[PDB]
Amino acid sequence: MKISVSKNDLENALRYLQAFLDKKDASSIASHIHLEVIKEKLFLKASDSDIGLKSYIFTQSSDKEGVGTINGKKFLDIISCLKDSNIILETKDDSLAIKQNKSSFKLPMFDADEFPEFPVIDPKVSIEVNAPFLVDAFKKIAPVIEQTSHKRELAGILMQFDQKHQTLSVVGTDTKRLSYTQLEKISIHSTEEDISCILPKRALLEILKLFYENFSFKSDGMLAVIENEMHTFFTKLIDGNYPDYQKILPKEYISSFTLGKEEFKESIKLCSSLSSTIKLTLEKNNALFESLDSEHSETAKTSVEIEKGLDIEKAFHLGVNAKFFLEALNALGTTQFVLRCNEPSSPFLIQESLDEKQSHLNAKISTLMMPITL
Amino acid sequence: MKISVSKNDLENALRYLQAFLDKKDASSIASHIHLEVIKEKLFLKASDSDIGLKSYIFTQSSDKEGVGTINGKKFLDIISCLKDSNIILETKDDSLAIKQNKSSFKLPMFDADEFPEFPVIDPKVSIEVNAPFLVDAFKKIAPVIEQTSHKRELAGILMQFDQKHQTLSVVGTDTKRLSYTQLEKISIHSTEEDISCILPKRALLEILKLFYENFSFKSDGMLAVIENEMHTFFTKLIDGNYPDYQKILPKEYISSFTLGKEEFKESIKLCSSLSSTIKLTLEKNNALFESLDSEHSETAKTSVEIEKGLDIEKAFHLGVNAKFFLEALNALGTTQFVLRCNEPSSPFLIQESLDEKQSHLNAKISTLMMPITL
Ligand SMILES: C[C@H](C(=O)O)c1ccc2c(c1)[nH]c1ccc(Cl)cc12
Ligand SMILES: C[C@H](C(=O)O)c1ccc2c(c1)[nH]c1ccc(Cl)cc12
């Protein structure tokens, strides 16, 4: 191989690749990036049985095509220390030479055949994502999912496609809260009417770094492959039977309250200075907040006026987990929210104000949460 | 006690105080700040046998004078969550009440008599620091000092006062490098012609957060007390016999080279991507840099043109520790530096370009460093 490339193009590609390297043992090919120069592109890949990324940059010049490997961390550390002007990469046996005016480096290459082949699938489902709504869903639902969950299928996000009705339902839960959205009018191409994919949390986080809009999502029910102009990503899927989220959602709610999002955030954060759980009291024209699990001589209280009166007689009391309630608020796009309740001992819902209205470049995420007793 | 205070004044004071609290065991008075309201001031202190801080803020109103205590971390966490408008602090038995419009808190106070008395000294030496030169010295020399040094007197910075000659010499070493400056024309008030104070590294770091200029420094040879308008700080001194730094500095240097500071930083950083130590080669019109301790198939090289020729025949070679050499450069205020050498196996000096010229609001820090053999 012998090429010249743009310093900034190469730095960028390498930063994205760092997440897919096992960097600690530099002696192992798991710390290296595979390189391949073909027809005016440098392809760079790092991969695994269960997750991987392939990218390319255009070569400024390309003189010798072929393949090789290089330690990814060291490569990125060298290139980040050079000026913003072309870099020459050239093999010299089982070594890669890096050159930029007076600065020169040599790093060892490993056998390129030891690199795992980058997998390709025959898709059973596919979509073109032309707007940010899916990543928006991903980002808003991610905090409810535990990556190190000892329960296998909850350690990822559900994507549930309905070809019939052109919907993609997206769901996360950790058993204490469950956040979901149903995306409308998605042109789904599928060999099945209804198909489901559970994506590991770790892949979800990597997707949020790589993709925003204008990408394809394709799955064979075993791997998902996500692709845009410069990147191909893949992940193993989690093995299956995601819980029936539809069965767990309440059918109706005794009470529905429209409440101020930012005033509830500030009030909850304030009380959480001394407690992880809060007693919320709703009256007609007031919301009161009190630390609940505080140490017994430590107390935080606040309140907020509700100008447009709630439909309450006396007072409804609800124990909440502060962090979870805030995360539910953080996932909302509106200035107000709706809190839907049944008994104080049963799960309650948090959603956007006017949640039926249809929005094209944002998802609308609802959260069901289990209350704290008392 | 019952006062009202400014939210921002109180937040600031509390942040500075966090460093002097043992925060993990909330049940111990070592996690609390002592409070005392006298004559339109709230005094806040946190202290130890060996280090401490006392601050004050003005009260907006003061109704009941007295004393109390409060958990410092919790207090700061509450106040950081309130609006930028007055806060009422009021005792209610062995509890402190905090109130701001609709928001109210209670925290437990401990017995104020269990708080250690804040020490006062009869000074043997004293100065008024009216400019940033001393903190500038502190900041530039601090990186060479190991706080967890198993050698007692090297775990701090030397301050060596000469009443006769109105100088304050300031020195740090970790045995591999030694950085020093001698500050001129300091009005020293002392009962001795020559006196020395070794300040612990930990106190040095706290001083850099609290003080800049317009402060007094006073010592009895056992504690140092540093004071400005709003703060009194103290520290135990380290017990003594700081090494004779003057004896360890070479008398003359065979070679002195004026070299480019920023070009040497970039070159060293670049080579340090693969190695902690570097081979520097100086020729007449070039400086060459090569990684030295790199893994044997990994190599970094660069060079820089020296336009105004050095006074060299063939080439001088010097092994350096990259991190130390950079820290020595970082401590300099000029665009160029002077590198003074004897044999490549002996210590070499790094100083500012034109180091004799006298500068009033910056210190000039020189660094002696032991080379790496080969
Ligand atoms: C079936 C699955 C499981 O038990 O792991 C499951 C997962 C999440 C929930 C649940 C049951 N039952 C629930 C009730 C309320 C909420 Cl917020 C979440 C859940
Ligand atoms: C006396 C003291 C010690 O041995 O601990 C000491 C401390 C620092 C140095 C030294 C001797 N001899 C040296 C030679 C060079 C340098 Cl940079 C520092 C030192």
Side-chain angles (χ1 to χ4, degrees), chain A residues 1-38 40-63 65-92 94-98 100 102-105 107-123 125-240 242-283 285-313 315-374, chain B residues 1-38 40-63 65-92 94-98 100 102-105 107-123 125-240 242-283 285-313 315-374:
Chain A
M1 306 185 289
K2 161 178 183 177
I3 60 192
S4 95
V5 300
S6 172
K7 184 279 210 187
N8 270 239
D9 287 349
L10 177 59
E11 195 170 354
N12 268 220
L14 292 178
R15 292 203 197 290
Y16 286 119
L17 285 151
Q18 302 300 310
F20 301 79
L21 305 166
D22 299 328
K23 286 175 282 308
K24 293 189 191 185
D25 181 2
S27 79
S28 164
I29 191 155
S31 70
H32 281 219
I33 291 176
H34 185 288
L35 300 178
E36 179 158 329
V37 180
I38 309 145
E40 336 248 73
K41 290 182 180 170
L42 169 61
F43 283 84
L44 304 95
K45 49 186 244 196
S47 70
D48 226 284
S49 170
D50 48 75
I51 199 164
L53 178 56
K54 167 164 23 70
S55 313
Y56 89 72
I57 59 178
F58 288 124
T59 54
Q60 298 306 294
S61 76
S62 167
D63 299 11
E65 294 179 329
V67 297
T69 83
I70 198 187
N71 185 276
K73 184 193 172 328
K74 297 166 187 295
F75 196 16
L76 170 65
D77 286 345
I78 291 160
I79 297 296
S80 63
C81 278
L82 294 167
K83 299 99 239 298
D84 304 295
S85 52
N86 295 342
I87 304 178
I88 288 154
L89 308 164
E90 170 166 7
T91 48
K92 288 208 192 319
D94 34 73
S95 182
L96 188 74
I98 304 162
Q100 205 205 49
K102 291 165 195 285
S103 292
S104 70
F105 318 81
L107 284 179
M109 311 211 299
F110 289 153
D111 181 2
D113 286 319
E114 196 178 307
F115 232 88
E117 191 84 296
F118 195 101
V120 301
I121 61 173
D122 202 303
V125 59
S126 90
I127 50 170
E128 210 62 61
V129 187
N130 281 126
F133 60 79
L134 177 60
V135 319
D136 184 55
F138 284 178
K139 173 160 166 169
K140 291 170 171 177
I141 289 170
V144 309
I145 299 171
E146 291 168 306
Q147 183 165 341
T148 84
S149 178
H150 312 163
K151 233 280 251 149
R152 299 183 27 62
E153 44 272 280
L154 303 185
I157 193 152
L158 178 73
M159 285 171 88
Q160 176 173 99
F161 300 83
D162 173 342
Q163 161 99 255
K164 259 260 189 172
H165 296 259
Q166 298 296 288
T167 64
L168 167 47
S169 279
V170 183
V171 190
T173 195
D174 63 0
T175 68
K176 310 258 181 143
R177 60 262 179 84
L178 189 143
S179 293
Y180 66 92
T181 194
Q182 186 199 279
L183 309 164
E184 302 299 349
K185 286 139 194 195
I186 317 308
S187 48
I188 291 151
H189 290 91
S190 184
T191 60
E192 258 276 325
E193 211 132 296
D194 300 295
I195 180 165
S196 271
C197 303
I198 299 164
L199 292 175
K201 172 62 181 282
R202 139 85 166 161
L204 182 63
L205 296 169
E206 301 317 324
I207 289 156
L208 293 171
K209 296 185 230 172
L210 296 156
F211 299 111
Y212 186 71
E213 57 191 345
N214 310 307
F215 61 84
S216 71
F217 179 96
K218 303 175 166 190
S219 184
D220 61 4
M222 293 178 73
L223 313 168
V225 173
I226 300 184
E227 171 165 9
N228 74 356
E229 170 45 55
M230 298 238 307
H231 299 303
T232 296
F233 172 90
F234 84 87
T235 176
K236 255 161 152 59
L237 297 177
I238 292 166
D239 237 325
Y242 192 82
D244 184 3
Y245 85 89
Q246 202 71 45
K247 94 193 239 202
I248 30 196
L249 290 170
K251 308 170 104 188
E252 322 209 294
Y253 288 95
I254 293 140
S255 322
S256 283
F257 309 116
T258 296
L259 296 167
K261 177 181 73 193
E262 287 311 312
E263 290 197 329
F264 268 64
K265 282 190 189 169
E266 301 179 330
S267 311
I268 289 167
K269 280 173 201 199
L270 172 165
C271 293
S272 79
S273 67
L274 298 175
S275 60
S276 66
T277 61
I278 283 157
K279 181 173 173 197
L280 168 56
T281 308
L282 299 185
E283 292 158 2
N285 299 101
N286 293 269
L288 317 185
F289 300 78
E290 301 175 67
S291 47
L292 179 56
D293 74 323
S294 29
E295 303 290 352
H296 213 258
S297 295
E298 314 183 347
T299 264
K301 310 166 54 161
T302 201
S303 71
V304 124
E305 191 180 336
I306 297 161
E307 290 204 84
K308 171 173 190 191
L310 302 183
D311 194 4
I312 298 198
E313 315 186 31
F316 176 79
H317 301 100
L318 181 67
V320 307
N321 172 302
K323 172 189 152 78
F324 301 167
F325 201 106
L326 296 174
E327 287 185 344
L329 298 179
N330 291 344
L332 314 175
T334 46
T335 70
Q336 292 186 115
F337 67 110
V338 181
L339 176 47
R340 308 196 187 274
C341 291
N342 285 311
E343 295 71 31
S345 49
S346 51
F348 58 90
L349 196 69
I350 289 173
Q351 58 192 161
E352 299 190 352
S353 178
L354 305 188
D355 180 80
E356 90 287 303
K357 217 211 101 317
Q358 309 194 66
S359 73
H360 305 80
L361 49 68
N362 52 303
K364 305 195 169 173
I365 273 64
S366 287
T367 301
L368 192 81
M369 264 172 289
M370 285 204 283
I372 309 305
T373 68
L374 296 255
Chain B
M1 306 185 289
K2 161 178 183 177
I3 60 192
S4 95
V5 300
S6 172
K7 184 279 210 187
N8 270 239
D9 287 349
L10 177 59
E11 195 170 354
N12 268 220
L14 292 178
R15 292 203 197 290
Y16 286 119
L17 285 151
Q18 302 300 310
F20 301 79
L21 305 166
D22 299 328
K23 286 175 282 308
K24 293 189 191 185
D25 181 2
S27 79
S28 164
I29 191 155
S31 70
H32 281 219
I33 291 176
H34 185 288
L35 300 178
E36 179 158 329
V37 180
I38 309 145
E40 336 248 73
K41 290 182 180 170
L42 169 61
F43 283 84
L44 304 95
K45 49 186 244 196
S47 70
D48 226 284
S49 170
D50 48 75
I51 199 164
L53 178 56
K54 167 164 23 70
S55 313
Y56 89 72
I57 59 178
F58 288 124
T59 54
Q60 298 306 294
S61 76
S62 167
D63 299 11
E65 294 179 329
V67 297
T69 83
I70 198 187
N71 185 276
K73 184 193 172 328
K74 297 166 187 295
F75 196 16
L76 170 65
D77 286 345
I78 291 160
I79 297 296
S80 63
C81 278
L82 294 167
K83 299 99 239 298
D84 304 295
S85 52
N86 295 342
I87 304 178
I88 288 154
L89 308 164
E90 170 166 7
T91 48
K92 288 208 192 319
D94 34 73
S95 182
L96 188 74
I98 304 162
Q100 205 205 49
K102 291 165 195 285
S103 292
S104 70
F105 318 81
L107 284 179
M109 311 211 299
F110 289 153
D111 181 2
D113 286 319
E114 196 178 307
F115 232 88
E117 191 84 296
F118 195 101
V120 301
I121 61 173
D122 202 303
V125 59
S126 90
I127 50 170
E128 210 62 61
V129 187
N130 281 126
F133 60 79
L134 177 60
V135 319
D136 184 55
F138 284 178
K139 173 160 166 169
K140 291 170 171 177
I141 289 170
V144 309
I145 299 171
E146 291 168 306
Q147 183 165 341
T148 84
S149 178
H150 312 163
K151 233 280 251 149
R152 299 183 27 62
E153 44 272 280
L154 303 185
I157 193 152
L158 178 73
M159 285 171 88
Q160 176 173 99
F161 300 83
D162 173 342
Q163 161 99 255
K164 259 260 189 172
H165 296 259
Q166 298 296 288
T167 64
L168 167 47
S169 279
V170 183
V171 190
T173 195
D174 63 0
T175 68
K176 310 258 181 143
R177 60 262 179 84
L178 189 143
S179 293
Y180 66 92
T181 194
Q182 186 199 279
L183 309 164
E184 302 299 349
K185 286 139 194 195
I186 317 308
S187 48
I188 291 151
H189 290 91
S190 184
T191 60
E192 258 276 325
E193 211 132 296
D194 300 295
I195 180 165
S196 271
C197 303
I198 299 164
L199 292 175
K201 172 62 181 282
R202 139 85 166 161
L204 182 63
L205 296 169
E206 301 317 324
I207 289 156
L208 293 171
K209 296 185 230 172
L210 296 156
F211 299 111
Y212 186 71
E213 57 191 345
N214 310 307
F215 61 84
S216 71
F217 179 96
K218 303 175 166 190
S219 184
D220 61 4
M222 293 178 73
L223 313 168
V225 173
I226 300 184
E227 171 165 9
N228 74 356
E229 170 45 55
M230 298 238 307
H231 299 303
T232 296
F233 172 90
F234 84 87
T235 176
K236 255 161 152 59
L237 297 177
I238 292 166
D239 237 325
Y242 192 82
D244 184 3
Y245 85 89
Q246 202 71 45
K247 94 193 239 202
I248 30 196
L249 290 170
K251 308 170 104 188
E252 322 209 294
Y253 288 95
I254 293 140
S255 322
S256 283
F257 309 116
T258 296
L259 296 167
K261 177 181 73 193
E262 287 311 312
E263 290 197 329
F264 268 64
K265 282 190 189 169
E266 301 179 330
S267 311
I268 289 167
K269 280 173 201 199
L270 172 165
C271 293
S272 79
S273 67
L274 298 175
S275 60
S276 66
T277 61
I278 283 157
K279 181 173 173 197
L280 168 56
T281 308
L282 299 185
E283 292 158 2
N285 299 101
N286 293 269
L288 317 185
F289 300 78
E290 301 175 67
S291 47
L292 179 56
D293 74 323
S294 29
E295 303 290 352
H296 213 258
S297 295
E298 314 183 347
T299 264
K301 310 166 54 161
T302 201
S303 71
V304 124
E305 191 180 336
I306 297 161
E307 290 204 84
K308 171 173 190 191
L310 302 183
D311 194 4
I312 298 198
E313 315 186 31
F316 176 79
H317 301 100
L318 181 67
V320 307
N321 172 302
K323 172 189 152 78
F324 301 167
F325 201 106
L326 296 174
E327 287 185 344
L329 298 179
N330 291 344
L332 314 175
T334 46
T335 70
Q336 292 186 115
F337 67 110
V338 181
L339 176 47
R340 308 196 187 274
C341 291
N342 285 311
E343 295 71 31
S345 49
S346 51
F348 58 90
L349 196 69
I350 289 173
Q351 58 192 161
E352 299 190 352
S353 178
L354 305 188
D355 180 80
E356 90 287 303
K357 217 211 101 317
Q358 309 194 66
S359 73
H360 305 80
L361 49 68
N362 52 303
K364 305 195 169 173
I365 273 64
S366 287
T367 301
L368 192 81
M369 264 172 289
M370 285 204 283
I372 309 305
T373 68
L374 296 255

